Amino acid sequence: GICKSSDCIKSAARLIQNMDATTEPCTDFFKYACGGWLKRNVIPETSSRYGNFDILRDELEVVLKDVLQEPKTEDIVAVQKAKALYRSCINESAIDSRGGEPLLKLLPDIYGWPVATENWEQKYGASWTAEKAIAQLNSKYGKKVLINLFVGTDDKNSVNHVIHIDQPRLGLPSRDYYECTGIYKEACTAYVDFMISVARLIRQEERLPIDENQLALEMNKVMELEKEIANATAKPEDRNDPMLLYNKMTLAQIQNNFSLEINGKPFSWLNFTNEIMSTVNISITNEEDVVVYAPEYLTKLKPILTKYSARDLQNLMSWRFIMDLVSSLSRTYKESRNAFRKALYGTTSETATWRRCANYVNGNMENAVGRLYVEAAFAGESKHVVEDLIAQIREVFIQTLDDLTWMDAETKKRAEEKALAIKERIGYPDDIVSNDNKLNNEYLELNYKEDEYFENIIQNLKFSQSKQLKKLREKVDKDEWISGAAVVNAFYSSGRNQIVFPAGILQPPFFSAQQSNSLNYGGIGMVIGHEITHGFDDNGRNFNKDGDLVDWWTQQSASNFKEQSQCMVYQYGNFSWDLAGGQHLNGINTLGENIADNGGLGQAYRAYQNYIKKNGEEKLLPGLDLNHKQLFFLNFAQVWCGTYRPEYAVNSIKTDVHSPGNFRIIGTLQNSAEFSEAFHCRKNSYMNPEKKCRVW
Ligand SMILES: CS(=O)(=O)N[C@@H](CCCCN)C(=O)NC[C@H](CC1(C(=O)N[C@@H](Cc2ccc(O)cc2)C(=O)O)CCCC1)C(=O)O
Ligand SMILES: *[C@@H]1O[C@H](CO)[C@@H](O)[C@H](O)[C@H]1NC(C)=O
Ligand SMILES: *[C@@H]1O[C@H](CO)[C@@H](O)[C@H](O)[C@H]1NC(C)=O
Ligand SMILES: *[C@@H]1O[C@H](CO)[C@@H](O)[C@H](O)[C@H]1NC(C)=O
Ligand SMILES: *[C@@H]1O[C@H](CO)[C@@H](O)[C@H](O)[C@H]1NC(C)=O
Ligand SMILES: [Zn+2]
After folding, report:
1. Which of 48, 256, 373, 560 is the most buried (most CB within 10 A)?
2. Does CATH place domain 51-377+430-476 in 3.10.180.10?
């Protein structure tokens, strides 16, 4: 009584080859489920982490290579542009023959780079202002420095767009790096070395005298400046509550309550915002409503920038943009980034060019490329089976509301309302395949030259930013997908109350219409519950059924939610990551994701129980001394088989809101009595602690 189909056999082979049965499931289920895989594999030199997700993504890149590399006589314009963009990206010979000349032509348009200019104060400083300088990088090239001003959705009115003002990203992975001691020292050194390397190459190409001490001087003041900005930014721990983060006020209020003296001139928030919004012929007045997400950061920023000069600021300003462009120039400029890349990611080589390019074209033309990917690699049968699964999971979540003892009736009724209102996106939007006109018009304003790769990417920055700035006065399009189809992930949008499962993730081990149900539920089923539970975690719970930031919790049910979720904070916060140097995981910044991982797996299991009840046991897999309840957990754990480079473990433990894959498995299964039941785990074994956390 065993399944012997071709599809059952591949499932079993993959499961057996990846697992390590000589480990005890109740001592360490990560090694039991993934020991086989870890011993067989080594992280590629071009990868910072490697595992099931990464392999499936590199596989997806191959499909994109196949469909992008050969032009076809039947291609529509939208497709012709993507292939032309791919071909310009992979030429490399054409790119190298241009040296840095594409960058030199661009620097005059961002008020130059003082370290690589001569008499910068007389050329630009005369007609230079913080308002104009920051605005030019924001509105034309989408680079947000010092002050990140962007157009987004209104958290308290998900139909409109509003102007947000938030603290900017930093050159290094996180503010923690700017200690520049111990584990962050090498990264800080490579970063400033990276500055000087680029500054030297530009001056060399401009035939300018090179004063090595003057280079070190200016570029180290840039680091002492970004150190200050970095220390002024808010922690992620202090940005977890969207209610407290949402501070709406007019531009007049901002001028009163958040002034800035920069290079003597008083900063004008009305001149800064109009310098940006004029890029699309839009006028702004002092009565404009603005949402400030980092007011604390703006106040600490006032006495930082009074100290520095227009030159000192612009040296950091342009460096943040040049930082990203050297990779798109000749190999002399590409190489200047090596020591910095290795410090942050551990990688000794750069990803294959065709792999980089396929990803770039997919990231900028995601509907045109999604069309090519689904036509070549996606079934269509799959779309309807997943709808069925999302229906089963959504109901298990509602069903489970009644069993929850820490919520009162009125909060449960409103929790059920939001759940029923969740909008689902499966596979791909049908009109990217059927409506050729709509797709061509998405890219009509774009025109790519094949020998001019650098000019193409600049076009895409301006197009990407111009289209976002134009959204200020228009309503949120509801039909829009939050992700392309050629993506191996899934997403939830609190502003839209929308879960999405692109075609890229609807393949094994996650899902297949031909693999055992125990695997589907433990795979895509757990992912579906995970995305659903995002609408109810420490952040998504603040949004109602329409994407509006509004309290719908009773004082008691809110207080209890915090109480229940504090267990998971301490659990994961007590995990030490050997790869990150024994550092502890940040249980606060990972809470939302561990809630989703724990609720999601719970919802999937109860959906597989409900299925067995209505349908019964399916046949077991060959070569596995495991029943289907144990197969459920095995496949769920094998979704996360992976490992990190030490350099990137240090990076991700600060910047990744997810737990590392190994601790997602252990933390989640430690809180699951059903796992311990399935694997008959002793009490207080490592995988079955008597104290177990639970929110959803
Ligand atoms: C506003 S937003 O929509 O953009 N919010 C993001 C927040 C995180 C961004 C990361 N892109 C979001 O929802 N992201 C999708 C992500 C999907 C899941 C996930 O874990 N995916 C991992 C995949 C991975 C990759 C490499 C590796 O070695 C190990 C694992 C990941 O991406 O790291 C898929 C299974 C459950 C969640 C989620 O739901 O959080
Ligand atoms: C790369 O660009 C050069 C210069 O424009 C051109 O001669 C060459 O044919 C291109 N390569 C390919 C494969 O088309
Ligand atoms: C970092 O910011 C805090 C808050 O303003 C301040 O008290 C502290 O002195 C700053 N640290 C440095 C090194 O400037
Ligand atoms: C902003 O001020 C500058 C003078 O510093 C001026 O040239 C520019 O036109 C102003 N921009 C707007 C949009 O008012
Ligand atoms: C570890 O767990 C204990 C017990 O709840 C808790 O007091 C402590 O804060 C946790 N450690 C971390 C780093 O979260
Ligand atoms: Zn998540």
Report:
1. 373
2. no
Instruction: Decide: 570 in ligand 5 pocket, CB within 6 A.
Output: yes
Please report how the helices 381-403 and 409-420 are oriented relative to each other, as an axis angle in degrees rounded to 10: 170
The experimental method behind these coordinates is X-ray
Among 489, 594, 638, residue to substitute to test ligand 1 (most atoms within 8 Å of Cβ): 489
The boundaries of every CATH 3.40.390.10 domain in the chain are: 1-50+378-429+477-696
> Is the bond leading into 25 cis (omega within 30 degrees of zero)?
no
Q: Which secondary-structure segment (H or E) carries 106?
A: helix 101-106
Q: How far apart are CA 424 and CA 500, in angstroms?
A: 6
Pocket test for ligand 4, best of 131, 272, 283 (most atoms within 8 A of CB): 131
For residue 285, the CA-to-ligand 4 centroid distance in Å is 14
134 forms bridges with which residues in the sheet?
Answer: none
Task: Say whether 618 is catalytic.
Answer: no
Q: Using an 8 Å Cβ cutoff, are 440 and 315 in contact?
A: no
* Nearest ligand, CA 180: 3
Distances (CA, A) of 554 to 46, 189, 565: 50, 51, 16
- How far, in Å, are 517, 626, 629, 665, 684 from residue 634 at the CA level? 13, 9, 9, 10, 21
Beta bridge partners of 2: 620
Resolution in A: 2.7
> CATH 3.40.390.10: does it fit domain 1-50+378-429+477-696?
yes
Sign of the C-alpha dihedral computed for residues 43, 48, 53 and 55 taken in this order: negative
Residue limits of CATH 1.10.1380.10 in the chain? 51-377+430-476
